Design a binder for this molecule. Structure first.
Ligand code: HEM
Ligand code: HEM
Lengths: 153, 153
């Protein structure tokens, strides 16, 4: 992962990206397509763009740059928000409480049991399967943080 | 992973948790501690509790259940938000556009170059290192989805 300061630095420069997203996106795609022309071959709708000049003149290349950098920014922000939720929990459960993954399994099963007991009319088989999967992701994600922190869970 | 409706089911039932978070948290920990009594040994303040009635009467246990379910809720919500944007991108770039991870590396290189060129004051060595790390996390998270989908990338 990234430190808090590092994520701050990523978000600060990304603010500069957002002040001119289309210009940035245009420049990123042109750099990509000039450096690695095979990548431009992936875009059938840019088949008419061959030269740098034509790439710079393209309305739709610029528009696509915006699409790309808007999507990337959102994913980077959402990753950071998730990492920040995991962080304090992994910290303490790895380095202080030392909670094995098998105990996280036991609490996950408890949660499913309680949900079924308290909401049998609204926590059917499908919804139960959804929660079972979400809790497995949660445990896997903590297990990956445990490893980063040096703890074998 | 979860489909979109599965995530929604997770969010929906957590809303129900949040309407009686105390009761839900109490029941979760009672289930855990009665099913797996060894887990009680982790809790200095609970490990004396033997019966369900005693566990229900403990204000400390009840308080803790709330703390646990609050924390888990925030992780689940933030995972869901990240997945909602990550999933469609991995899906289209594996299935339709067929974009190898190496081409994501190439566009990462272009992003790092463009940011350094445009914003050197906000993109010194540490800040660049942070962005390099954040784009690797992005690529790795797409690669994991690619493996789930059977796409070589
Ligand atoms: C930071 C990495 C990237 C992001 C965030 C990104 C984002 C997007 C988004 C949001 C779309 C539109 C919706 C969709 O189809 O998913 C799209 C379309 C597409 N992407 Fe990407 N992309 C990335 C990298 C690449 C790379 C490296 C290539 C090719 C070498 C590529 C090729 C395409 C193609 C061919 C389309 C469809 C274009 C069209 O005909 O409109 N992507 N991308
Ligand atoms: C859904 C899974 C879990 C969640 C969300 C969770 C959450 C929390 C939170 C938010 C705290 C307080 C702040 C902190 O120390 O991080 C905490 C404390 C603690 N947790 Fe967990 N926990 C989970 C599972 C477990 C399990 C299974 C065990 C043991 C079997 C455990 C043992 C402890 C202990 C011993 C403390 C300290 C209690 C105290 O001194 O007051 N946790 N947990």
């Amino acid at each position: 992962g990234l430190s808090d300061g590092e994520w701050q630095q990523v978000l600060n420069v990304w603010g500069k990206v957002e002040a001119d997203i289309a210009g940035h996106g245009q420049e990123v795609l042109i750099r990509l397509f000039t450096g690695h022309p095979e990548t431009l071959e992936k875009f059938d709708k840019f088949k008419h763009l061959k030269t740098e000049a034509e790439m710079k003149a393209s309305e739709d290349l610029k528009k696509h740059g915006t699409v790309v950098l808007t999507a990337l920014g959102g994913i980077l922000k959402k990753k950071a928000h998730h990492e920040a939720e995991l962080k304090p929990l992994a910290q303490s459960h790895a380095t202080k409480h030392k909670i094995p993954i098998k105990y996280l399994e036991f609490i996950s099963d408890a949660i499913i049991h309680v949900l079924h007991s308290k909401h049998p009319g609204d926590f059917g088989a499908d919804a139960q399967g959804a929660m079972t999967k979400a809790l497995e992701l949660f445990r896997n994600d903590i297990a990956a943080k445990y490893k980063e922190l040096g703890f074998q869970g």
